[PDB]
DNA sequence: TTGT
DNA sequence: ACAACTGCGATTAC
RNA sequence: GUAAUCGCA
C-alpha cells in the first residue's frame, strides 16, 4: 500500500518518503527500494 | 504476482541481500545486538574449533546465519555460498562491474 | 537521481502552453494496465510529458486538491460520470463505483511501479 | 595490527594453520614505553586487576 | 492416504486466512482445518528436533484488542476515541475482579467500530449455538451438571452480567451505546467470547512493558493441552504476537497444534471458563476425608512417575512401552491422594493393603453419591448426536469425573497387587 | 431542537461531513421513497435532534428519488508511530446530496425508467439546508421532449444545473484542458501586466 | 590531554587510583573497551 | 514520558512511556498542559544515564540498547554539523492620486523630500483600464 | 598574535 | 605558565 | 630517524 504522486519530487520530499519508508518497511526494504529508485533516476537522467 | 519480476528476485538472490534480510530478521528477535553479535562471534568460534579444515573457502559466521535461518523454517544455501553454473572454465573468473 | 526523480515526476503543459487556441471551440490514450503504457513508452508510441489516462482497481491513493467535481454528468439511465482535476470517476444508479481512471503521465507509473516492484521483489526473494 | 609484538608473531602462525585468534590480554608496546619512561621520570604505574572471586591482587608486568 | 487428526477433519474457507492475510498475518507450516467441534490448527510439515523454537504464527497488534490490567486502562490498540461514554461504562468497573466486562464492551465497540478487524472476524467466531461457554446455558444443564457449587457460581456470573446489562444499557443511554447490545443476550454473548478467548501475556510497546488482557484473533483456534506443543511469545520490535513451537519436541505432518491455558487448575475452572473438561487433567483435587494414607515414594515407583511434586511425567525411557495405564490421571490421584513420607522407613503391606481397601470403599461411597453410572452417561450421550453443547458438556464432565474416580480404584488395586513382587 | 428522540429505522439516514439529514421513509418494496413532510438535521453523530431550514417548497407526496453524493476526496498523510502504520488516510468528504426524482414515480425495474431532471433537492451540510435546484432546460422539446435522451451538467460547486442534450456532450479531457487553459491564461496576464510595456502588447 | 606534567605530578604526589571505567583509560592500556561489545550483560 | 497526562477520566499516556509525532499531535490537539518528560538532566547519577532517562535512540528508533556510548555521539553530532523596510512598488504605469492634507511633510534618510504618513490612507494608481490602491 |  | 584541524604524500638537509 | 619547505583533499 503506497500512495501514487502526481506533483513534482524535490529533495525534501524525497527525504520524507525516505524516512516514511524506513518507518513503516524497515531499513531492509529501504535499502533496496533506494537502490533501484537510483537506478531509475540516473538512467532517466 | 507481478510478471516481470523473475531477474529482479534472482539477482536479489545472487548479489547476496539474502544475507541483509536474514540479519534484520534475526535482530528483530532479540533487544541487545551487542549480546547477539557476542552470541554469533561465539558460536563461530566453536564452529572453527570443531573443524578446521572445513573452512577456508566458506565462513563459519556465514553457516552460523544459514543454520539459523533453516532451522527457522527458512530456506537457505549452506553458508549463503552459490557457484556459478555458466562459467566458462578453470581460471576464468567474472568481472563484477 | 534527483534530477531524473524531478523530470519523471514533473508533469505536463496544462495551459496555455499545450494548447495555442481555447479548446472551447472544440489525454487521448487509453491504457488498462501499467505495463502498456510502458511498452508504449518505450516503443516511443508516447512521450515522457504525453498525458494518458490509466484505469485503477478501486485504490483511490492519488494524493490530490480537496476540490470538487469540475464537471458531473448525470444520464437518464442512472450512470453520473465525476469529472476530477487529475481522474475520472465513473458510477452507477446504485451508487457502485463502475470505473476510475487516473490521468498521468509515464514517470508517475513508471516510479509507482518501480517502488511496489522492489517492495514485492523483496518480499518474494526473502521465501 | 599495530604493536603487540607476541600477538603479531602469533597472528602469521594462525591465519596460516586456521585457528581462531585469541584475544590479547598482555599491554601493548606503547603502554610498556609510558612505564618505563615514567618510572624514568620517578613515577610508577601498575595495572593492579583484582579478582571478584577471591579478592585478590594481581599485578600485570 | 495416512489416517491422521487432521485428516478426518474438512479444510477451512480461503476467505478465513485471506482476511488476515492482506493486514499482514502469516502462517508458516500450518493449516486450518473445520469441524463439527470448530477451527483447528493442525501441521503441514515434519519438523525435527531443533535447537530453538520457531514461529507458526506472526500475528500483529493492529488486529488485536487489548486491555491493561492496572488501574490506568490504556487501549494500545486504540480504537476508542476520546470523550466516548463506553469509556465511562469501561472504567465504571472494579479494576481487581471484573476484566471481561470490559473486554465485551471493547469487542462491542469494535464490532461497532467501521473498518475493523474484528467486523470480518466475528463471522467465523462461534455463534450462540455454537459457544461452548456456561453462560449460554439453560436452568437444565445447570441441574444435569450434578454439582452445586459450579452451577451456583455460573448462576451468580449470569446474574452478573443480566445486572450490567441492565444498569448501563438502560433506556436513557445514548444510541450509540444502544446499538453496541439492544438485547442482553448479546452482552452475554459477548462476555462468553471475551471470557472463553482470553489471553494473559505481559508486552512491551516502545518504552512501556506492562501485563495486558488481550483479544488475539487466529490464536484462540488452538486446542488445549497439557504436554502443549507451541507457546505465545511475544516480539517487541515488530509489535506482533508469535507463537513457536517448542524446542526440542518433534512433530509430524497431520499433528494437531496445542497451546495451555491455565496450567495448574482443575477442571472447574475450565468448566467456569472455557466449557471445557478433559479426563486427563493431572491437577484434578478428589477430596479423600479417610485417615488412610498410601506411601508416595512406592506408588510413584510402581506408576514410574519421576520429578518433584512440582513437576510429573510418566519417564516412558524406563517404562520401555507396555504400561500405557499411566497418564494425568494416575499423576492427579497421586497427587490428591493422602500420602505419607517417613525418611527411608519402608512401606508394611498389611498397613498399605487395609489403607486402599478403606480408600476403594470411599471411592466406591462417592461414586454411589452421584445418581448415576459410566455407562448411563456414555448411553445418554451417543443417544443424543445432535443437542444442545451444554448439557454435551455437563455429561462430559460427570463421565469424566466418574472416570477418573474408576481409574483411581483401578491404580489403588495395581498398586495393592504390584507392591508385593 | 424536537426534543424526542425519533426511531431512525422509519427514516432515510443521509450522512455528511458536519451533519446527518433524516427523512421518513414509507414502506416500500425498495427504499427508493422518501417523506418531505418529517425531516431531521443532527450533528455527526449525535442523538440530538433539530428541524432544518426548509428554503424551499418541499414535495407534500410520497415520490421516488435516486440519492446521489458531491464531495471531494481528502487523501492525507498520517504520521507513522508504528512499523505496519498506514501510509496514507482516504476519506470521501460528502459536501452535497442530491435526490432526483424519478419520472412518474416509476421503479427501477420498470421497462421504461428515467429520472426526472427537473425537481432536483440538494443538501448541504455547511448550512444544514435543504432546498430545491434551478435547472435550465436546454434541448429541444420543451415538456414534450423524450426523458431517454437527456444529460443533466453540474458545474460550479453543485450551484450550476444545465439539461442538454445527451449526443452534445464534452469529454473530461476537453472540459479538464479549458479550464487549465483558462486558469493559465488568467496567470500569465496576470504576471505580464506588471511589466511596463504591457499596454503596447499583443497576446499571440 | 592539556596540562600532562601538571595533573601527572598532583596524582604522583597525592597517590591516585584510577578504576577504568572510561574509554581513553582502556585505550591507553590497550584493552577492550566497555562499550557495545564490550559491555558485559 | 514521567508522569501521566489525563484528558478528563481518560488517560492519553502514561508514565514510563516514549512519546512519539502522533503523541505530540493528540497533545498539541487537546492542548495539554505542561509535559512531563524525562530527560539526561533528571537522572541519577553524572557519571552514566540509563535507557528511560536518555529516550529513543536516534540511530533506529528504539530505547538505547545497553552498552551504547552516547557521550560520544553527542560530541560528534554536535562537532560535525560546526562546519556550518519592505519597499512598494507601483502596480502599472498611471497617475498618483491622493489627500496630501493627511500627509506631513518630512525629509528623507536620502535628502530627498517625501511625505510622512501615520494614518491608513489609500492611493490610487490610474492607469488606462484599472485602478489600484 | 590571541587569549587564557 | 598553557593551548590554538585532521591526516596523507613529495623533496633536501642533517 | 628528525627537521625545513611545498603540495593534497
New binding site residues.
Given amino acids: 500500500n503506497l500512495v501514487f504522486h502526481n506533483k513534482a519530487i524535490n529533495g525534501t520530499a524525497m527525504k520524507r518518503l525516505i524516512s516514511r519508508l524506513i518507518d513503516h518497511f524497515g531499513m531492509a526494504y529501504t535499502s533496496h527500494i533506494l537502490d533501484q529508485v537510483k537506478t531509475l533516476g540516473f538512467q532517466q537522467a | 504476482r507481478i510478471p516481470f519480476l523473475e531477474e529482479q528476485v534472482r539477482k536479489i538472490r545472487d548479489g547476496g541481500k539474502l544475507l541483509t534480510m536474514d540479519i534484520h530478521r534475526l535482530l528483530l528477535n532479540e533487544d541487545n545486538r551487542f549480546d547477539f553479535v557476542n552470541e554469533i562471534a561465539a558460536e563461530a568460534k566453536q564452529y572453527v574449533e570443531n573443524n578446521r579444515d572445513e573452512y577456508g573457502a566458506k565462513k563459519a559466521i556465514l553457516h552460523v546465519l544459514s543454520n539459523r535461518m533453516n532451522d527457522a523454517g527458512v530456506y537457505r544455501a549452506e553458508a549463503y555460498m552459490e557457484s556459478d553454473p555458466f562459467k566458462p572454465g578453470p581460471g576464468y573468473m567474472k568481472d563484477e562491474l | 537521481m534527483l534530477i531524473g526523480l524531478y523530470v519523471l515526476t514533473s508533469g505536463n503543459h496544462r495551459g496555455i502552453c499545450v494548447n495555442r487556441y481555447n479548446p472551447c471551440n472544440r489525454k487521448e490514450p487509453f491504457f488498462s494496465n501499467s505495463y502498456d503504457a510502458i511498452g508504449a513508452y518505450r516503443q516511443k508510441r508516447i512521450n515522457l510529458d504525453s498525458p494518458l489516462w490509466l484505469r485503477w482497481r478501486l485504490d483511490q491513493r492519488v494524493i490530490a486538491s480537496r476540490e470538487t467535481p469540475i464537471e458531473v454528468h448525470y444520464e437518464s439511465l442512472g450512470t453520473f460520470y465525476e469529472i476530477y482535476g487529475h481522474y475520472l470517476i465513473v458510477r452507477s444508479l446504485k451508487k457502485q463505483i463502475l470505473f476510475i481512471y487516473i490521468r498521468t503521465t509515464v514517470g508517475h507509473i513508471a516510479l509507482y511501479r518501480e517502488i511496489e516492484e522492489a517492495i514485492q521483489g523483496f518480499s518474494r526473494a526473502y521465501s | 595490527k599495530s604493536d603487540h609484538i607476541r600477538a603479531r608473531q602469533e597472528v602469521l602462525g594462525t591465519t596460516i594453520i586456521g585457528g581462531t585468534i585469541p584475544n590479547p590480554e598482555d599491554a601493548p608496546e606503547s603502554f610498556r614505553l609510558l612505564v618505563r619512561e615514567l618510572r624514568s621520570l620517578a613515577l610508577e604505574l601498575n595495572h593492579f586487576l583484582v579478582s571478584e572471586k577471591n579478592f585478590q591482587i594481581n599485578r600485570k608486568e | 492416504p495416512h489416517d491422521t487428526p487432521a485428516s478426518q477433519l474438512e479444510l477451512a474457507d480461503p476467505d478465513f486466512y485471506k482476511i488476515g492475510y492482506v493486514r499482514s498475518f502469516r502462517a508458516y507450516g500450518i493449516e486450518f482445518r473445520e469441524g463439527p467441534d470448530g477451527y483447528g490448527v493442525f501441521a503441514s510439515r515434519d519438523v525435527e528436533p531443533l535447537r530453538r523454537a520457531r514461529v507458526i504464527m506472526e500475528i500483529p497488534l493492529e488486529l488485536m484488542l487489548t486491555i491493561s490490567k492496572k488501574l490506568p486502562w490504556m487501549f494500545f490498540p486504540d480504537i476508542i476515541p476520546v470523550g466516548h461514554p463506553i469509556f465511562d461504562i469501561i472504567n465504571s468497573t472494579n479494576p481487581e475482579t471484573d476484566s471481561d466486562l470490559r473486554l465485551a464492551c471493547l469487542l462491542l465497540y469494535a464490532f461497532d467500530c467501521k473498518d475493523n478487524f474484528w467486523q470480518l472476524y466475528g463471522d467465523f467466531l462461534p455463534s450462540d449455538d455454537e459457544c461452548t461457554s456456561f453462560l449460554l446455558a439453560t436452568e437444565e444443564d445447570l441441574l444435569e451438571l450434578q454439582d452445586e457449587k459450579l452451577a451456583s457460581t455460573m448462576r451468580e456470573q449470569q446474574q452478573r452480567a443480566l445486572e450490567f446489562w441492565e444498569k448501563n444499557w438502560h433506556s436513557a443511554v445514548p444510541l450509540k451505546i444502544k446499538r453496541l447490545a439492544r438485547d442482553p443476550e448479546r452482552f452475554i454473548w459477548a462476555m462468553c467470547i471475551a471470557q472463553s478467548r482470553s489471553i494473559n501475556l505481559q508486552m512491551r510497546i516502545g518504552a512501556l512493558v506492562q501485563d495486558a488482557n488481550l483479544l488475539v484473533p487466529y490464536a484462540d483456534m488452538m486446542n488445549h493441552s497439557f504436554q502443549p506443543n507451541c507457546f505465545f511469545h511475544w516480539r517487541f520490535k515488530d509489535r506482533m504476537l508469535e507463537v513457536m513451537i517448542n524446542a526440542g519436541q518433534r512433530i509430524r505432518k497431520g499433528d494437531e497444534m496445542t497451546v495451555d491455558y491455565m496450567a495448574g487448575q482443575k477442571n472447574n475452572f475450565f468448566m467456569q471458563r472455557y466449557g471445557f473438561s478433559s479426563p486427563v487433567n493431572p491437577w484434578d483435587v478428589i477430596h479423600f476425608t479417610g485417615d488412610a494414607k498410601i506411601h508416595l515414594d512406592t506408588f510413584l515407583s510402581v506408576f514410574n512417575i519421576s520429578g518433584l511434586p512440582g513437576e510429573y511425567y510418566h519417564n516412558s525411557r524406563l517404562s520401555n512401552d507396555g504400561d500405557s495405564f499411566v497418564d494425568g490421571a494416575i499423576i492427579a490421584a497421586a497427587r490428591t491422594l493422602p500420602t505419607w513420607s517417613d525418611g527411608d522407613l519402608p512401606p508394611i503391606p498389611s498397613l498399605e493393603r487395609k489403607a486402599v481397601k478403606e480408600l476403594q470403599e470411599e471411592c466406591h461411597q462417592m461414586l454411589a453419591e452421584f445418581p448415576t453410572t459410566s455407562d448411563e452417561d456414555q448411553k445418554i450421550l451417543d443417544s443424543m448426536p445432535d443437542c444442545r453443547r451444554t448439557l454435551e458438556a455437563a455429561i462430559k464432565y460427570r463421565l469424566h469425573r466418574k472416570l477418573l474416580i474408576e481409574k483411581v480404584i483401578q491404580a489403588l488395586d495395581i498398586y495393592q497387587d504390584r507392591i508385593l513382587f | 431542537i424536537v426534543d424526542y428522540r425519533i426511531n431512525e429505522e422509519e427514516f432515510h439516514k443521509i450522512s455528511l461531513l458536519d451533519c446527518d439529514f433524516f427523512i421518513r421513509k414509507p414502506p416500500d418494496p425498495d427504499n427508493d421513497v422518501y417523506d418531505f413532510r418529517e425531516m431531521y438535521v443532527t450533528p455527526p453523530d449525535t442523538d440530538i435532534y433539530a428541524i432544518p431550514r426548509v428554503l424551499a417548497p418541499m414535495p407534500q407526496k410520497y415520490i421516488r428519488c435516486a440519492m446521489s453524493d458531491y464531495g471531494c476526496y481528502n487523501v492525507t498523510e498520517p504520521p507513522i508511530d508504528a512499523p505496519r502504520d498506514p501510509m496514507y488516510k482516504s476519506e470521501r468528504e460528502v459536501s452535497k446530496v442530491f435526490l432526483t426524482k424519478h419520472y412518474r414515480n416509476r421503479r427501477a425495474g420498470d421497462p421504461e425508467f428515467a429520472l426526472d431532471f427537473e425537481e432536483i433537492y440538494v443538501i448541504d451540510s455547511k448550512t444544514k439546508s435543504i432546498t430545491r435546484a434551478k435547472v435550465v432546460v436546454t434541448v429541444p422539446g420543451g415538456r414534450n421532449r423524450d426523458r431517454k435522451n437527456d444529460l443533466l451538467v453540474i458545474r460550479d460547486n453543485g450551484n450550476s444545473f444545465k439539461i442538454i442534450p445527451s449526443e452534445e456532450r464534452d469529454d473530461p479531457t476537453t472540459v479538464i484542458e479549458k479550464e487549465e487553459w483558462k486558469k493559465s491564461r488568467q496567470d500569465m496576464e496576470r504576471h505580464l501586466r506588471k511589466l511596463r510595456d504591457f499596454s503596447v502588447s499583443n497576446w499571440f | 590531554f592539556?596540562?600532562?606534567?601538571?595533573v601527572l605530578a598532583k596524582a604522583a604526589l597525592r597517590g591516585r587510583i584510577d578504576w577504568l571505567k572510561g574509554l581513553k583509560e582502556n585505550v591507553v592500556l590497550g584493552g577492550v573497551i566497555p562499550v557495545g561489545t564490550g559491555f558485559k550483560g | 514520558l514521567a508522569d501521566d497526562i489525563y484528558m478528563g477520566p481518560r488517560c492519553i499516556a502514561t508514565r514510563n512511556q516514549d512519546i512519539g509525532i502522533g503523541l505530540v499531535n493528540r497533545f498539541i490537539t487537546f492542548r495539554a498542559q505542561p509535559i512531563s518528560i524525562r530527560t539526561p538532566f533528571t537522572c541519577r547519577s553524572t557519571s552514566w544515564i540509563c535507557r528511560l532517562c536518555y529516550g529513543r535512540s536516534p540511530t533506529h528508533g528504539d530505547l538505547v540498547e545497553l552498552g551504547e556510548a552516547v557521550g560520544i555521539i553527542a560530541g560528534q553530532s554536535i562537532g560535525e554539523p560546526g562546519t556550518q523596510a519592505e519597499h512598494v512598488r507601483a502596480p502599472s504605469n498611471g497617475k498618483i492620486k491622493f489627500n496630501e492634507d493627511l500627509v506631513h511633510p518630512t525629509r528623507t534618510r536620502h535628502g530627498h523630500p517625501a511625505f510622512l504618513c501615520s494614518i491608513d490612507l489609500y492611493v490610487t494608481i490610474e492607469s488606462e483600464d484599472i485602478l489600484h490602491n
Fill in positions: 592539556q596540562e600532562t606534567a601538571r
